[PDB]
Amino acid sequence: ERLDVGENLKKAEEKLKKAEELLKKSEEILKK
């Protein structure tokens, strides 16, 4: 059967997208 770490790699992708939006929200507070 296939090697599949697709779960670990998918969760890591979610976490990095969540980090991107948080950093956006932070730079937006600092601008105001």
């Binding site: 090697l3 770490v5 670990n8 890591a12 976490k15 932070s26 507070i29 600092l30 105001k32």
Partner: protein, 42 residues
């Protein structure tokens, strides 16, 4: 400027949350590479 202090605090608090998400990303990347090591060894 005590308003600028309040904005720096709310900003740094949101920044700490971004970093915790990146750290959780790193934990998942470690599992994934162990996944690849085992499948090859095992």
């Amino acid at each position: 400027n005590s308003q600028a202090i309040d904005n720096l605090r709310a900003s740094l608090e949101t920044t700490n949350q971004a970093i915790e998400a990146i750290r959780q990303a790193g934990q998942e990347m470690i599992l994934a590479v162990q996944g690849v090591q085992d499948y090859i060894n095992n």
